[PDB]
From Swiss-Prot, chain A:
Keywords: Cytoplasm, Isopeptide bond, Nucleus, Phosphoprotein, Ribonucleoprotein, Ribosomal protein, Ribosome biogenesis, RNA-binding, rRNA processing, rRNA-binding, Ubl conjugation. The keyword Cytoplasm applies. GO terms for molecular function: rRNA binding; structural constituent of ribosome. InterPro entries: Ribosomal_uS4 (IPR022801), Ribosomal_uS4_CS (IPR018079), Ribosomal_uS4_euk/arc (IPR005710), Ribosomal_uS4_N (IPR001912), S4_RNA-bd (IPR002942), S4_RNA-bd_sf (IPR036986). Pfam families: Ribosomal_S4, S4. Component of the ribosome, a large ribonucleoprotein complex responsible for the synthesis of proteins in the cell. The small ribosomal subunit (SSU) binds messenger RNAs (mRNAs) and translates the encoded message by selecting cognate aminoacyl-transfer RNA (tRNA) molecules. The large subunit (LSU) contains the ribosomal catalytic site termed the peptidyl transferase center (PTC), which catalyzes the formation of peptide bonds, thereby polymerizing the amino acids delivered by tRNAs into a polypeptide chain. The modification Phosphoserine is found at S183. Its main location: cytoplasm. It is found in: Cytoplasm; Nucleus, Nucleolus. Residues 159-185 are annotated as: Disordered. This is Small ribosomal subunit protein uS4A. Present with 106000 molecules/cell in log phase SD medium. Belongs to the universal ribosomal protein uS4 family.
From Swiss-Prot, chain B:
Residues 1-29 are annotated as: Disordered. One of its GO terms (molecular function) is structural constituent of ribosome. The keyword Phosphoprotein applies. It comes from Saccharomyces cerevisiae (strain ATCC 204508 / S288c) (Baker's yeast). GO terms for biological process: cytoplasmic translation. It is found in: Cytoplasm. Component of the ribosome, a large ribonucleoprotein complex responsible for the synthesis of proteins in the cell. The small ribosomal subunit (SSU) binds messenger RNAs (mRNAs) and translates the encoded message by selecting cognate aminoacyl-transfer RNA (tRNA) molecules. The large subunit (LSU) contains the ribosomal catalytic site termed the peptidyl transferase center (PTC), which catalyzes the formation of peptide bonds, thereby polymerizing the amino acids delivered by tRNAs into a polypeptide chain. The lineage of its organism: Eukaryota, Fungi, Dikarya, Ascomycota, Saccharomycotina. The chain holds residues 7 to 59 of 63 of the full protein. The keyword Cytoplasm applies. One of its GO terms (cellular component) is cytosol. Component of the small ribosomal subunit (SSU). Mature yeast ribosomes consist of a small (40S) and a large (60S) subunit. The 40S small subunit contains 1 molecule of ribosomal RNA (18S rRNA) and 33 different proteins (encoded by 57 genes). The large 60S subunit contains 3 rRNA molecules (25S, 5.8S and 5S rRNA) and 46 different proteins (encoded by 81 genes). This is Small ribosomal subunit protein eS30A. Belongs to the eukaryotic ribosomal protein eS30 family. The modification Phosphoserine is found at S10.
Curated annotation (Swiss-Prot), chain C:
The keyword ATP-binding does not apply. The lineage of its organism: Eukaryota, Fungi, Dikarya, Ascomycota, Saccharomycotina. Residues 41-104 form the S4 RNA-binding domain. GO terms for biological process: cytoplasmic translation; translation. Coiled coil: none annotated. This is Small ribosomal subunit protein eS4A. Component of the small ribosomal subunit (SSU). Mature yeast ribosomes consist of a small (40S) and a large (60S) subunit. The 40S small subunit contains 1 molecule of ribosomal RNA (18S rRNA) and 33 different proteins (encoded by 57 genes). The large 60S subunit contains 3 rRNA molecules (25S, 5.8S and 5S rRNA) and 46 different proteins (encoded by 81 genes). It holds the Pfam family S4. There is a cross-link at K61, K133, K160, K167, K173, K178, K210, K232 (Glycyl lysine isopeptide (Lys-Gly) (interchain with G-Cter in ubiquitin)). GO terms for cellular component: 90S preribosome; cytoplasm; cytosol; cytosolic small ribosomal subunit. It is found in: Cytoplasm.
Swiss-Prot record, chain D:
Gene3D superfamilies: Nucleic acid-binding proteins. CDD domains: Ribosomal_S23. It comes from the Eukaryota. InterPro entries: NA-bd_OB-fold, Ribosomal_uS12, Ribosomal_uS12_euk/arc. This is Small ribosomal subunit protein uS12A.
Length: 185, 53, 258, 144, 25
RNA sequence: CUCUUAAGGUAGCCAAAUGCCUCGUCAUCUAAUUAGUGACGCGCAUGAAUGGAUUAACGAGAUUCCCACUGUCCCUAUCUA
RNA sequence: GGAUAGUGGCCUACCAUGGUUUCAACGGGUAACGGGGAAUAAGGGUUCGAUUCCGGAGAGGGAGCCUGAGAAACGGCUACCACAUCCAAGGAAGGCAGCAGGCGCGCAAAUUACCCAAUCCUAAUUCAGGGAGGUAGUGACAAUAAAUAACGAUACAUGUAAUUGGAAUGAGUACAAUGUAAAUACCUUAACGAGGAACAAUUGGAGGGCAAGUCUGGUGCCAGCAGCCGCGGUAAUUCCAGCUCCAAUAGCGUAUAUUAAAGUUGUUGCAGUUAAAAAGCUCGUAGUUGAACUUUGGGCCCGGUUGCAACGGGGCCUUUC
RNA sequence: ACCCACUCGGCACCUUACGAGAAAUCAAAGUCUUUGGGUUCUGGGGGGAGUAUGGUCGCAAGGCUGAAACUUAAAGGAAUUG
RNA sequence: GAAUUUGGACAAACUUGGUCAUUUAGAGGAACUAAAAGUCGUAACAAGGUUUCCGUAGGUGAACCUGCGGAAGGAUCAUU
């Protein structure tokens, strides 16, 4: 048969199910960032644990060891490109000292809100879900998008999505067709 | 001794439900919980509480 | 298992074909031929994956059955003909000649060459043996037997093969200080000069190679191919000349394009 | 020393001693002896269908009361007779004598759960439909 | 019961079992 | 709890070559068993060198079953001196 | 010597008396095909691996053999055994552990669908064939992304109310067009398709562990719950319900197995006076382990890598290659 | 023979514990999470059970070896106040 | 050159016997466990009313009793 299809999990549940402080922190994050469920925090903490593991493996190696140099430079490049690691923290220890909010900030549901394109994070969530936001010449309907710090200058509405161009919408048309009658004629 | 298998469930009044507006399932429900819990609504009773009495 | 296998499952093909994983269940099994199963490169792979001329195996065989492709001077209409190292793939429609040589990553690099040097090819002398009637002969890396060889052509030497008469025009002798291609192992695709040969009677012959950048790597005699002297390769080398840059300087060369 | 060989060439003694002492572990000994296959009426399986034979009220162990309404079941697989608790308020009326019930473990891997003496199985389905889905009015038992 | 007398009773049981197994064949 | 003896049959063993009832009861053996065997035992009336219980080997001893084998029989016939 | 393609006790003839073994032979078990690998995992490990690749073996159980380069072949044959089809009773034909599909077994697993277009394979061969394979159907195995609403106005004290307004969209549906071998679906979209947006989210819980109720009704050591501790006996925060609340969420619970937790298998790394555990004592073979000592120390060079220094070499002398 | 001082080896003892331990206590039961001097034996919750079975030794009594099914949320140690 | 046919080696399979393994019936016997506030006594925990316990041996309805040697885990760290 055909070669197997590789697939991996993207999250990890907490070991203690009912830790009240962790529950309150997760709910704080979900309310601030408009998250659907705890699984999104789980996924971000899983990504952060993988990043931290790689950074720890590299930091245990000798400095100027070629593998450490190459792979740490690549990891730092990826993080600063995504905007999670700041511009002045390119040291592979700030990679260790990152946080969940540093990844939740680069979410498109957060960038759309912080760019004034939406009134709240939930407005941003529904606006991305409803195909209203385009990153480049490409509609992006996925809240978790991890803007590349260059798409930030390009996150605007689509030529579709009647907030940034041609069409007037769907319920506007029916309300016009019924306001024609409501006018009396 | 059988023939007593319903001495509570069967002989308990059949109170019906109460039709109420649906809950906003999902991200909306997470937002509802967040506002209910972390805007410091009057539910403290000294330190914290999540039910009346 | 009752006979010779005729199938080659994908993920069992030689990796240096860069074959897609989820294309199909099977790879083109190299038919019996000059070089080997693993060290070969089928004409279908080189026509549909290395040049994109054809899009399917059907189209590869369509190209092949009208005598367009030509391996070492002959037509080779076999869809899965096992072309390999130092082979000349000339096509007269889209007139151009390639020499199947190894890039420094260990794949069969697409290496356009001119007709004036595609006329011939190189061959590593696999063995020197007296044939019937006392006629000496040489067997080369590609499975060629050439009678009446030069009495000074020994094993591990390289011979320049006319490829139209199939005779020895010249021969380079294996010795310390000649240009050698590496045709197997970890260093598959590197080019360098022989520094020293460790003998190991009974065991395996080892050879220490120093590339242009003074990197010194050892490898088994089985997979080193003399290709001339330093700076005068008897053939044209591919775009990388077997230098084996490390990943860091490779990334540097890549980012030098902004 | 620590009562165990430390020498660089002591690996055989160390591993043989570990092999001998692993037999004092419940799980290792059970798995290597294959208890679940010979013993354990469920032949190392999670669930087993069986035919009810009798309704039974076993008086819960002290300090409790309230006899627990189990059923004697004869397993289709091997033929053994096991007592299975019928978990819910009521839910015995949905199981009939000489009726087919799916049985599952009682969560304790033997060593019967709770105050129900000698009862280590519970009923999950009857006549092909869930006991819980019969407690709730979602489905109803096939006629029999 | 005392462990010593438990052992004695068990030994008497073992003797009886040996005798029964001997009478049988 | 009684009456009572010198002591009240202990360890064992048993319808036993010792049990009346009795062809005892249960099991096994068989189609069928007053037979045999294994158990049970308030045992008419078992039992300790009047030796108790058991025992490999041995036995022209008593007994039951099985295989083999056969005129013992079904069912007789024939031949020789 | 025979036999084999060939080595070889592979077989035979004669001869010798050897070969393995506590460093575990031989025998027994495996609900054992081996490996690549998988789960879990601070490190060390524990467990699993029928199964996408490699190797092996088998085609109901054995055995034998034809052809052929290659089979001890089974969608080849021959025989026996067990099954089992047909029959005009004379006879004849079998082998799904290929693809579908049926029965049986079970806790436990899909369509008697389309196609050679791709991947490749086979032949005399560019054409034919391929249940190999691909495509679709079933499918909450597992995995990825993530709809169930968003924003205003009014009253009340940022939030409360079946007080109300304008937008947004896909879930669906559907001209076409793309996709496809022909489709389906996805992507893209004409028109339709939101107001208790009924286009209504569930699964488990609220004594502790463990997040969440001395709320109300019911039951009264009953019914039942409860992994464990326990709760139920007319005052139930634990059962049956209503309301409310908590957890995870298109998933959640239950059972079994296994991993971590387990430093409760301990090499790292356990414990043995009294909790389980030092043999009654000594000898002793294998095993494990076993005191110290032989060229050190000066000096001169060349040359590296990092920042004159540090660190690393290689070569000479010094009784020394 | 005794006295004094020293010394090696031995049965012990007293005080203090740096230290150890759950504590009782311990100059070893210390030099152990700062975990490795060598080495043998043994244990892995409580019962069932040192039972059944097989082997072996024994005249026998018994010794050595030695399970499982099943069952159970404690059993147990040291110490404190009653 | 077919039928047939001699002798070989390879040998399925069947019959009988042997042996091993795993399930399984069984009169009766003898245990264990659970439940049961049944009967009989009160053996242990206080010097538990005979200190307890270990090994061994014998006896007795039952716990247990007794002899011999041992232990303190004793109810004694103690008579220069
Ligand atoms: K109770
Ligand atoms: Mg008597
Ligand atoms: Mg009698
Ligand atoms: Mg008799
Ligand atoms: Mg008779
Ligand atoms: Mg006498
Ligand atoms: Mg007499
Ligand atoms: Mg005589
Ligand atoms: Mg020979
Ligand atoms: Mg395995
Ligand atoms: Mg197997
Ligand atoms: Mg496998
Ligand atoms: Mg299997
Ligand atoms: Mg395979
Ligand atoms: Mg085969
Ligand atoms: Mg079959
Ligand atoms: Mg065959
Ligand atoms: Mg078949
Ligand atoms: Mg086949
Ligand atoms: Mg099939
Ligand atoms: Mg819904
Ligand atoms: Mg859609
Ligand atoms: Mg409730
Ligand atoms: Mg709580
Ligand atoms: Mg322990
Ligand atoms: Mg004790
Ligand atoms: Mg002890
Ligand atoms: Mg020794
Ligand atoms: Mg030494
Ligand atoms: Mg134990
Ligand atoms: Mg105590
Ligand atoms: Mg007393
Ligand atoms: Mg006393
Ligand atoms: Mg007294």
């Amino acid at each position: 048969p055909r070669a197997p299809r590789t697939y991996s999990k993207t999250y990890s549940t907490p070991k203690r199910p009912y830790e009240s402080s962790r529950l309150d922190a997760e709910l704080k994050l979900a309310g601030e960032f408009g998250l659907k469920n705890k699984k999104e925090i789980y996924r971000i903490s899983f990504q952060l644990s993988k990043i931290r593991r790689a950074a720890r493996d590299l930091l245990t190696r000798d400095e100027k060891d070629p593998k450490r140099l190459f792979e740490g430079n690549a990891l730092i490049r990826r993080l600063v490109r995504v905007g999670v690691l700041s511009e002045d923290k390119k040291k592979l220890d700030y990679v260790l000292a990152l946080k969940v909010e540093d990844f939740l900030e680069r979410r498109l549901q957060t960038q759309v809100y912080k760019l004034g394109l939406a009134k709240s994070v939930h407005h941003a969530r529904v606006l991305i879900t409803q195909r209203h936001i385009a990153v480049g010449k490409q509609i992006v309907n996925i809240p978790s998008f991890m803007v590349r710090l260059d798409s930030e200058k390009h996150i605007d509405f689509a030529p579709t999505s009647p907030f940034g161009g041609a069409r007037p919408g769907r319920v506007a048309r029916r309300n016009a067709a019924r306001k024609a009658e409501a006018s009396g004629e | 001794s059988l023939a007593r298998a319903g001495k509570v469930k069967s002989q308990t009044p059949k109170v019906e439900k109460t039709e109420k507006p649906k809950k906003p399932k999902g991200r909306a429900y997470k937002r509802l919980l967040y506002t209910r819990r972390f805007v410091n609504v009057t539910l403290v009773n000294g330190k914290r509480r999540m039910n009346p009495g | 298992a009752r006979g010779p296998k005729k199938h080659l499952k994908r993920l069992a093909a030689p990796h240096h074909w860069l074959l897609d994983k989820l294309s199909g269940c099977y790879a083109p099994r190299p038919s019996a031929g000059p070089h080997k199963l693993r060290e070969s490169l089928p004409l279908i792979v080189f026509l549909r994956n290395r040049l994109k001329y054809a899009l399917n195996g059907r189209e590869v065989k369509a190209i092949l059955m009208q005598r367009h492709v030509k391996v070492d001077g002959k037509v080779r209409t076999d869809t899965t003909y096992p072309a390999g190292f130092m082979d000349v793939i000339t096509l007269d429609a889209t007139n151009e000649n390639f020499r199947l040589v190894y890039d420094v990553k260990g794949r069969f690099a697409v290496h356009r060459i001119t007709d004036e040097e595609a006329s011939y090819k190189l061959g590593k002398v696999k063995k020197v043996q007296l044939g019937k009637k006392g006629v000496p002969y040489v067997v080369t890396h590609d499975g060629r037997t050439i009678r009446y060889p030069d009495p000074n052509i020994k094993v591990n030497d390289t011979v320049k093969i006319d490829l139209a008469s199939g005779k020895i025009t010249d021969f380079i002798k294996f010795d310390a200080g000649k240009l050698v291609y590496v045709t197997g192992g970890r260093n598959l695709g590197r080019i360098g000069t022989i520094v020293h040969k460790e003998r190991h009677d009974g065991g395996f012959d080892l050879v220490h190679i120093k590339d242009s950048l003074d990197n010194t790597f050892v490898t088994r005699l089985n997979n080193v191919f003399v290709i001339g002297e330093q700076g005068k390769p008897y053939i044209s080398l591919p775009k990388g000349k077997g230098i084996k840059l490390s990943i860091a300087e490779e990334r540097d060369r890549r980012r030098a394009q902004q | 020393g620590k009562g165990k060989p430390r020498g660089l060439n002591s690996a055989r003694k160390l591993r043989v001693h570990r092999r001998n002492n692993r037999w004092a572990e419940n799980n290792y000994k059970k798995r290597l002896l294959g208890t679940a296959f010979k013993s354990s009426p469920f032949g190392g399986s999670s669930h087993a269908k069986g035919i009810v034979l009798e309704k039974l009220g076993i008086e819960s162990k002290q300090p409790n009361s309230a006899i627990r309404k189990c059923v004697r079941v004869q397993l289709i697989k091997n033929g053994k007779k096991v007592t299975a608790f019928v978990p819910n308020d009521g839910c015995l009326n949905f199981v009939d004598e000489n009726d087919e019930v799916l049985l599952a473990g009682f969560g304790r891997k033997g060593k019967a759960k709770g105050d129900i003496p000698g009862v280590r199985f519970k009923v999950v389905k009857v006549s092909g439909v869930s006991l819980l889905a019969l407690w709730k009015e979602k489905k109803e038992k096939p006629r029999s | 019961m005392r462990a010593k007398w438990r052992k004695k009773r068990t030994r008497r049981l073992k003797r009886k079992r040996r005798k029964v197994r001997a009478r049988s064949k």
